[model samples]
Target chain A: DWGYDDKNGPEQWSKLYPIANGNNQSPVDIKTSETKHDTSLKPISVSYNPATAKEIINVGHSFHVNFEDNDNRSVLKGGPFSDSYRLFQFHFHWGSTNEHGSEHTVDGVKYSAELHVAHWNSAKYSSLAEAASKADGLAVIGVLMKVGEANPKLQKVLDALQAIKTKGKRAPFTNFDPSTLLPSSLDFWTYPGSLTHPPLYESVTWIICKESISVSSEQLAQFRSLLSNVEGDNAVPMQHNNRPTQPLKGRTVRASF
Target chain B: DWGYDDKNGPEQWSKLYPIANGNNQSPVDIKTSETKHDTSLKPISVSYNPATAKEIINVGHSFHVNFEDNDNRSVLKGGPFSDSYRLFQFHFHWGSTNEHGSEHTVDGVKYSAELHVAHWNSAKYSSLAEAASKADGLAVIGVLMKVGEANPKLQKVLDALQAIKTKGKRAPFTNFDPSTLLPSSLDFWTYPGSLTHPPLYESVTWIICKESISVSSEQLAQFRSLLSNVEGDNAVPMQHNNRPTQPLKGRTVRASF
Candidate 1:
């Protein structure tokens, strides 16, 4: 299986998944100067039914908070989208160190970690697997996190890390609104990108938040303690899980002011 | 013996040259939004004597155009520098295809190719080798090349590729002005950076041109045709010679507009 090790990292991903080098790949460095200002871009509307929050699991590469997306109870609207995207899952990309995490860079500056709230087009396809291959099928909100004051909103996710210390481990998580983790500013940069990891389907419309939320250094260390292996396997820290920024190609990144 | 192959690429570089993962590494993505516009930055002054152009050689990785830098005849000055930097050599970084080449990205957007004109602080150090270990000891001027009309100036370098088709090959090349390859505008982004390759020294003051020059699709193909191996070994194309953007690591990129 593809992982973030030297032998099976992003550079080797193309061998198994040819689309890793596709034109519209994700986790792009958000160069603010080149971004086009679009007044027509509307404010993103996120309505999450906390009751839909299900379980948090260690997927080997990174941990994720899975949501019950069978219906449109938790959906993302507006902001470069004509259809409502149903919230399915949310995860993070981080580094072993504080200085070099966060897949999406802001003017080449990396944050401590990045939050990816993934949603599939509910108005178009019945399931995420169905919508994933279509160009206008997925929408992901990327929130960058810097090292600073501890966020009470993030404590719930960090506390659940203990139960899911090893790969494939899971813990019951409930009543969590992903939006509570977002920065106050809704201003964002929107571009057509893809899934950051392997089998990089070029189908995501990326909405990256302009403002950054804070995560304490101690809190970030907890994120690094989680193992990439199973209970008996040799322990490897699930750090450096973030993919480096891929080539932007000629895609125009529109900023919603 | 490290190259851009999956087995010996940038991902595996840290094993051999530990500093390959060091902070302030080069070929970084120049994010324009977070750049601080410094009015104090003076216009960069470049003076190159065409006679100083000496020879062109293939060094197993990429081809380089050598220069006579015993004196300050070919030097770069003014922008973000206190000492005159003597130009010692110049080289180009390209990709397998025109879609993704160049090292330093502008807001995550890549160019077809990039030009690196290397120079050492002559006032502070005696040789390029001596200057390479210090923090403020070397400087590199990076010019981005977009695919457009064939560049007449670049044709000279491309023409010489025929003789030095393989690694460890050298050909007499002279009287070509390196400055002629630079774009018309001098607007640039300046930052503290390092060499893009292994033994990755944090010595360079990177001055990247905001304006990009043009190269043709045919010219780019010529670059890919050069062999990474020598005359005896099986010919491997010397494409994808450019390093991907490294972590920015809280360094401030200042713009000279």
Candidate 2:
């Protein structure tokens, strides 16, 4: 029952969803000290059924799709060196300022935006929680954003924002292709990490991609417009849903050539 | 009987596909000399149905979902500031090195990859030819890709590369959510332009997103592995399929933020 008042912001959200107070909240800023040493890690593979996915438009945020049951598995596509993985929910991290907002930092360099395609190892463990302890359980792709260009493909989601101005509402989308969102090059860096979200699950084998998708300023505004500082309130300013950065903890990040 | 060794690369594709030789080919590079004096150019919206799409993984190039009806009418999602438009065939442009490849260049900066989501005008136009002459009849979204850490989201497409390893082969893709590929931001840039492919249609209103997406090198290599130097050959090197950079032709590129 929180409202848009300053006292009812995310800082106060802990009382509403007690989970927020736990040691495993999301968007954890990485500090280089907490990482453990375990080098016997392997990469994982991912698979999805593009047809049966559920598409949703979160008013001002961005377009998203939930993978079907079958699309959630991963296979070792890279070779024997990689680990088998599974697809988890994917989401975007944005900013109040268009100039800077992202999840993962490379040597402390922040980009305009970051898209996290989270995956967990399936071969050695049963759940993401169990895999996070090892070095090869998770993979994330980190993309950078710059100011200068407009994206037309984004219009499909932008145009629908006007209809779903409230949270917990959804619309039907069709004909859009997910592959179109990928950058032309697939070169990327690989690393091991814990979940950026709640329960701070350590079973993630992150494979942050190097390329980023672009968005317009108006679209960012539109996303902000739909969010409420407090849950269920639309008039509240949508700022700082993101978790602070975490310590890298002396972990080594690898890049795929 | 054409193979990778023949002069069948996209550079010479015009000689292979009859449609490529037409004046209506896409990826039309505009030169400053062809500037028109119309200052009131506006883009159009689009009309489309996603259920009728034909999904195909372009062998090793990437996953391409081509939409066409028996009457040559395609479906599409509309643009923000344009009139209703129609769906057109979509294609991709990649690089040999995986470090740099893109279709749209922003002030001379090259992204690792780019995606062109093309659409045509369906109102009062019998064919793409007639629509190509209008300023507001087409729409294209430019998605940027950068070299990043690593991404498991790309593994789904990369794994499928082995199943469709040759040209002109078609496969059915299911459970794909197109909206999942959208950037977290909606900020975009809009401008007047022609198709990058043959047909050189001048009906496009280009919208490039501000955010870039991250992809791994292995995913890029998988894309390069799909393309052929020739039309039907499979063993040729998979480089140089993209059209060379085009001139801006003095068209006004606007940022929609």
Candidate 3:
């Protein structure tokens, strides 16, 4: 599972999936002192259609609303990307408290939550899986979220969670536009890195949004309400599901305005 | 999920699956005065094989070590049912701490943890799911545990926790006989009730062992060390999976010595 356990977490993944220990692993701390203000970087472009919204599921690792990848309904272009990328899925990562939930620690501060919008190099590769291992294959937009006001956009997603409480359980979710969930600013940063998860493939060009979205304490609490452990799993909680930050690995983090 | 939460737990089950709100719900309180000693009841016979242990998994609701029930290599035949119940799986229920994890309370008192040894009618039922709803079709052995010596048998299971740190995760296990975990005596209290979880099927004939087992402070600590929540799921705490005690509903409770 490579869950956030003392033994089988981000650190232990190297034993199960060797690529995790590679040089370009993700979820790194982006230091302003080290990042380059690249004038050649282009401003980001995002066009997401709610028509691509499909089912919401609980996979034990996290609660996710998966997007349909049959077509290019939601796409992002520009920034460090040479070609337009097709959106496939988006999910959130958070913590048990108001602290240290974001996977990417920017300037050593972990936000309350982080939203990942995953896309693939549709122009260069035939499939998302096919582009996963190739250089310049995938792109993920990381949006920082803070503990604050209740955002109404999350209500529908949280409401559907009751039906998909445990692993493999899913509920059909449709017509929900993924783009409406984005923050106001499109300012970003870019870098070459691997997936935060396994096989820890190093085909991704990381893009991080500078602005943060606000979520209420109730909304955050709503996110935590679903029971994940099995029926007889007892009260002693065994594993946390988030992977901690990987090494920056000497790669330059580039800022794009 | 038939879990304890503000939304989709025991209280919310009747809104979707009405069987949960019935009068004969499980995890009922066990009062010593209400139990009548039955000298006519036969002693329980347990037969377990180390080869039958196929895997250990975390099923979102609980962690379980499941047996290979294809053949009658492991079974429970005696005292409560007309047919021998095939051993399929076994799991535990506990609190967040070592003192209050039990589902069934005794004289309004709870234990640190309670183990459920699950079996189904192999003689008449086509499947475990089919037998789950029929009265007198399934049986489960319940054992209470307390802090004491370091059980050598539990050490292996505790070691396996690092592997299955998340839900839907499984690890291969073999040559581990479950019978080694049982206490010296087979004395028990018998009653009819529904499952302690949601769907709350009213089919089980519960056999609660009078004698409890021992696990040292470190073993209990191993049980509690799991991370309870995934980041971004900030609504509530997910573990402490025990259901509250239900009403007795006038059913006669029997004790076998």
Candidate 4:
């Protein structure tokens, strides 16, 4: 059902899976105008309580650690200028183009890939979807990627990719810390915007890092090899899933240096 | 008794713990003169066979995952490079300067921290230490670290530091893949050299990544917070345990673009 043919392409995806289309989409292009400059915006803080962060196995999503399980202490306590955002799902946006691939766009420039660290506001909304409407509810970190020699570390994930290639398959993997994937620096540019995809929720608080992580060409090739089209057909090439640049509408982007 | 007093420093460490002066001391600095540019160096490949990796707890290190292990897949199968080198024990070098700390020096510059992914030649010696004397016996990857925002992913480990703040303590942490700790890119620079520490073995092929990872200052504080000095001395800090810069020995550093 997930073929890359006309019907399977993201353009027509909403017609097929109404929920997926209705749910917040990705590949949102960032516009400088949509960002708001708020001197009062508070810094992001994470207080992780291991007991509160329980691992969940979602069908097709593989292993996931939920930090908003009420009991989990890994809560994202937003500061003065920011609202409390609850951690949700995490996914990757890779490239179809050999040289460049990424989800979010910065002033219309795309990188090798972008990591979507999605979070929703817990204070105002009962559900993540509901919170997607307000600008204070969502936060995403866009990390760039560049080509390099083969990465042995990525090989582990690529090797396991075939195991969960199918949608709805789940697996158990623990002690896999997400911090390992972060670039060496946290100096980031923050902005206020909408979801990068369809339904384009305007409530996103975007935090895009200036630096990017390096991934080998071999690793990218392996990802392409393992990832399949929507319908479970032959592996489909992944590239340019991002939306075109949008009007900034007079927004301001802020940086935390 | 370990204290930060003038005579208790790491420079004077050799005088304190006689065993610490072992010929295979850590942070072995590499020099260029000791390297041979022989065209016969074989190409190396890493075979991921978890079963072949022997995991053993290192009594002196407090982290549960500080277990020692090695793999043979790294044997130089055949290439223009030196003989095949097998991976050996992995360890960490942290800081004393609080702001600038690390073990490996790149172009004589120091970062906050560094991780050594050690490897030894399978064709040359019976043990990693024995092979440390040859040019083809060792290969090491040096990852640099910089301080920035607090990293949530590292929170679990930082929180646990208080519990294992001593030598010889062990805990069980399974399903950990070291590859995950690798930065997204594998772009690296290679050179023929020796260990950065004692025994000063010239048998290493060093691969230092040009990029560094961003770690929150709090995480560094956590690492610094845990240490064992003399009896009843819980206040001794774990800073500045790294070795001073050694001569580069005019080695040719090859960057993998």
> Which candidate number maximizes lDDT?
1
What is candidate 2's CA lDDT for residue B86?
57
- Clashing pairs counted in every model: 1, 136, 26, 51
Candidate 3 lDDT over A132-180, as tens digits, reads 8987889999888888776887878877975765556788988887777
Ranking of predictions according to TM-score: 3, 1, 4, 2
Better of 3 and 4 by DockQ: 3
* Top model number, DockQ: 3
**Residue A88, candidate 3: alpha-carbon lDDT:** 83
Query: Of 3 and 4, which scores higher on lDDT?
Result: 3
Q: What lDDT would candidate 1 get against the real structure?
A: 0.87
Q: Which consecutive 10 residues in model 1 chain A have the weakest lDDT in total?
A: A230-239
lDDT of each residue in B1-257, candidate 2, tens digit only: 22222454445645644544443333333232333334343332233455445566554434475555334344444235534555555555677555457766555566666767666666556666677667677667767777665556555455555455555666765444333454666456666666655445556777677677776554454465453422322143355345555545455555543
lDDT of 2 at B131: 72
CAPRI-style docking class of model 1 based on DockQ? incorrect
The per-model DockQ list reads 0.01, 0.01, 0.07, 0.01
For candidate 1, lDDT tens digit of each residue in B70-105? 888899999988899999899988887777889999
Model 4 docking tier (incorrect/acceptable/medium/high): incorrect
lDDT (tens digit, per residue) of candidate 4 on A179-219: 45557776567766666554566677777776777776545
Error of 4 at B135 (Å): 47
